[PDB]
Structure formats: structure tokens, C-alpha cells
Amino acid sequence: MVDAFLGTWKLVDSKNFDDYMKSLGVGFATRQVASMTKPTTIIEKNGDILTLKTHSTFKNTEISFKLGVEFDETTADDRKVKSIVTLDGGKLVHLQKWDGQETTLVRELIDGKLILTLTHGTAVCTRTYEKEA
Ligand SMILES: CCCCCCCCCCCCC(=O)O
Structure with missing residues (x-):
């Protein structure tokens, strides 16, 4: 059941994206x-x-x-x-593998917002998207 993730979403909050990119x-x-x-x-x-x-x-x-x-x-x-x-658990989990490395991009819905959690190494970034009409 992927349907509540569908649509157009705009970034409205970002935490630790620099840490993730740097990792x-x-x-x-x-x-x-x-x-x-x-x-x-x-x-x-x-x-x-x-x-x-x-x-x-x-x-x-x-x-x-x-x-x-x-x-x-x-x-x-x-x-x-x-x-x-x-x-997984109602979350859309995207796993990427390369060179023996991994990163996960986990999407979930909380109070109608799309929360994207990005993990690589020890870096954990949380980005929030709100849906466009
Ligand atoms: C060339 C620009 C590269 C920027 C960093 C990209 C890192 C992986 C993709 C992150 C996706 C973040 C998002 O969808 O909000």
C-alpha cells in the first residue's frame, strides 16, 4: 500500500544534510x-x-x-x-549498495508530512516534505 506517498512534495525542513553529503x-x-x-x-x-x-x-x-x-x-x-x-512497517525504505557501502533513504508519513531519513556511516539526516495540491 504505497498510495499515501504518491503526489508532489516540496522540501520544508532539513536537518544534517551537510553531514550526510559530507559522509x-x-x-x-x-x-x-x-x-x-x-x-x-x-x-x-x-x-x-x-x-x-x-x-x-x-x-x-x-x-x-x-x-x-x-x-x-x-x-x-x-x-x-x-x-x-x-x-517496511508502512515506511518506504530505499537501500543503496556500492563498493561494500550502504545508505538508506527511509520515507514515512507523520501528520500528513513526508519525513525522509537518510543514513550513511554515522550521519543521520532528516528532511521534511509537505504535499502540493
Ligand atoms: C550533485 C548534487 C549532489 C547532492 C547530494 C545528493 C545525495 C543523495 C541524494 C539526496 C536526496 C535528498 C532528497 O531527496 O531530499
Whole structure:
């Protein structure tokens, strides 16, 4: 049941995103721009296939996947990873693997807001998105 995640979402709060980016090795100038960017995330489904778009003034990404089926992904910061997205506890959990490393991108709904928790190494970032009409 992915349906309450679907729609267009705008970033309205960010905590520790610089720590997360730095853990991934993102360079200072990119982190600087990213710290001032408010992406729009669009999540849509067509049958079993989800498409997740991230749009900003800096950098755009798009992925399509089936829940529970691995896919190749090239992230915004140009990591080539093996990914899987699943529902776990009502949360949409995206796991990326590369070079023996892992990062998780966990989405959940709290009071109608989309909370994205990003973990890599010891870095834990929390970003909050609110839905666009
Ligand atoms: C080139 C710009 C790279 C910026 C850092 C990207 C890190 C991985 C993706 C983070 C996604 C955050 C979000 O969807 O709010």
C-alpha cells in the first residue's frame, strides 16, 4: 500500500544534510548549493511500477522501480549503486549498495508530512516534505 506517498512534495525542513553529503564525499561547493536548494519530489505509480522524480534548480534525478526488485541507479552525486525499495512497517525504505557501502533513504508519513531519513556511516539526516495540491 504505497498510495499515501504518491503526489508532489516540496522540501520544508532539513536537518544534517551537510553531514550526510559530507559522509558520501560530496565536495564543499556542491554541498553549499545543496544546502540552499528546496527540491520537489514527485512519486507516481502505474501498476507495479513506481517513478520517483527529484527536481531542483541544481540537479534533477528520476528512478523507476518495482517494489522488492533490485535496480541499477546513478545517484545525484554520481554513485553507481544497486538499489531496492520496499515497504517496511508502512515506511518506504530505499537501500543503496556500492563498493561494500550502504545508505538508506527511509520515507514515512507523520501528520500528513513526508519525513525522509537518510543514513550513511554515522550521519543521520532528516528532511521534511509537505504535499502540493
Ligand atoms: C550533485 C548534487 C549532489 C547532492 C547530494 C545528493 C545525495 C543523495 C541524494 C539526496 C536526496 C535528498 C532528497 O531527496 O531530499
